[PDB]
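User: Can you model how zinc ion sits in this protein?
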Amino acid sequence: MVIATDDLEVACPKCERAGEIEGTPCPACSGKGVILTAQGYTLLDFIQKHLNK
Amino acid sequence: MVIATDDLEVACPKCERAGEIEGTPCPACSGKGVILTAQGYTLLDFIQKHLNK
Amino acid sequence: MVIATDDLEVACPKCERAGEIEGTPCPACSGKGVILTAQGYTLLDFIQKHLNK
Amino acid sequence: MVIATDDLEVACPKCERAGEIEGTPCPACSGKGVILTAQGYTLLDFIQKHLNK
Amino acid sequence: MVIATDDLEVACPKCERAGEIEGTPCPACSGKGVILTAQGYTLLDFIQKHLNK
Amino acid sequence: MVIATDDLEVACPKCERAGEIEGTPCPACSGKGVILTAQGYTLLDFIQKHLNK
Amino acid sequence: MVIATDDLEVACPKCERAGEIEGTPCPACSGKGVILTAQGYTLLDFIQKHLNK
Amino acid sequence: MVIATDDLEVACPKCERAGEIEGTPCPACSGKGVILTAQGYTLLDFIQKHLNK
Amino acid sequence: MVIATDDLEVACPKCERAGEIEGTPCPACSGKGVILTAQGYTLLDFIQKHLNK
Amino acid sequence: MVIATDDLEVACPKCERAGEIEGTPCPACSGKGVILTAQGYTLLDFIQKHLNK
Amino acid sequence: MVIATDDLEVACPKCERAGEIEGTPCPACSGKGVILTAQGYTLLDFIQKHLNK
Amino acid sequence: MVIATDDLEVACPKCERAGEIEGTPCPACSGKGVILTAQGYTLLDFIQKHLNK
Ligand SMILES: [Zn+2]
Ligand SMILES: [Zn+2]
Ligand SMILES: [Zn+2]
Ligand SMILES: [Zn+2]
Ligand SMILES: [Zn+2]
Ligand SMILES: [Zn+2]
Ligand SMILES: [Zn+2]
Ligand SMILES: [Zn+2]
Ligand SMILES: [Zn+2]
Ligand SMILES: [Zn+2]
Ligand SMILES: [Zn+2]
Ligand SMILES: [Zn+2]
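Assistant: Here's the modeled complex, given as structure tokens:
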């Protein structure tokens, strides 16, 4: 596998994957529990700008 | 090409990509004509998760 | 990384990336300001084909 | 790792790796429980035609 | 193979590699029928720069 | 290059590459201003384990 | 596909994949119609060395 | 070259590639003088499972 | 990911990654539990040769 | 090294690198002593098509 | 991008691609401003050796 | 081997690997006989800034 999940996202340091810091959704990761890598951004940006257009 | 179609999907070998055998949707791939790889699921899962949020 | 933006899109020659011919949607890259590569088409086809499908 | 098991075999969606459907060999994957990818077929073909010749 | 033709040039999508639309020189590839990728420019520029010298 | 700084390090979202929040050392990345990727840890752990041993 | 057939075998220049010249074994590729590359040899030797051992 | 011999097996530390130790096969690499890597094991497993099937 | 742990280290088959055999340092991996690949030696040697010089 | 000479050229089987069979140039490798791979062909074709033209 | 400029040439470290230090042709790379890698020499060699010979 | 020594270090043009010019220590590569690539500095800098924390 050329590109794996850990090529695409890093586990959030702030909320350590929980998506919420003590009741409140976590601001570092937008409630995702995960932060994008350069590679993940690259892929997501491409799809977003080209998908269905 | 780092990541080709054949790295994402396997042509279902029963119906040879058709999706049907003699009219009846193929009993292996079950329509899709294609079966996803670990790598294909990774990408799709990543996008499904992060797209538009 | 393994696959960058430049592996996925080329800068369109007609509009030079602006996507617009002084007001009018550029007819070459169809507004995008960019043209997809084999690799970019592969990714985008896969995602459109299987996303939420 | 360059080329993983998942790059070579996909799990069979009919029998989910069991190789059998209610006693009899699974007709999708032909009893193997697994379906080869283009990459897998490539390696195997090469070996089959050249090994011990 | 590591570097294929499709990694080096894009089929000009406007004319399907003809370089001409309805008698007219196609504006998206400039008659060439093909647009160079970042990768293709790199190799070509590198050979341009160092070959015979 | 096959492995760039951004393949190894991600920018710290909490401190924005500063390493400090209001003077006190930043808790999320523990002083660095940067969070390591799976690839970054793979590399770093290998080196720490075998270096000068 | 990280390693293709053409990464493994080259088409024979003497017999263009036929394996015989005039009816007699083709002395260039010794009947095979194909020549192994360094990569092909590597895989073949590895497998021949370890298989069933 | 995508996958080398050294990607597939490591030189045994006890017998430095020779198969024997003072006469009898080496207690570590069991005669082979080499130790398989994750990658080499993967290939060999795959071939043993599907070859002549 | 481009370079994984198993691309750098091989799990020692004489001691199952433990390091010690029946209390004594293992003759294969020399107590480490792990044997380095050519890839792993190349990184290590590069770092030990250039680090802090 | 991503692509080596062995990935580009194979040794000629008829002349075994000599480029000459009994005084007269080798009709197989046209005297070069070497045969191109698909990768070598694609690289060479690209450069010839685009080099300062 | 499989093979980048940086993979082919190194910026001469004393002059920073300038080719000159204070008017005088740079002693280190003496002119080019750049030093070829093994990878760069391999492609260049190949092209020089095979281009319309 | 994804990343070899020749992807990290380049032979110094001035001292041709010897690190020395007629006794006088080489100023191009400051004694080392080798110049680092962009890839080589990436890894060395990453290791230097994170090692021992
Ligand atoms: Zn979070
Ligand atoms: Zn089917
Ligand atoms: Zn345009
Ligand atoms: Zn099945
Ligand atoms: Zn066109
Ligand atoms: Zn921080
Ligand atoms: Zn032949
Ligand atoms: Zn041994
Ligand atoms: Zn051990
Ligand atoms: Zn010849
Ligand atoms: Zn210089
Ligand atoms: Zn020097």
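A couple of observations from the model: Helices of chain H lie at 38-50. Chain H has one domain: 1-53.
User: Helpful, thanks.
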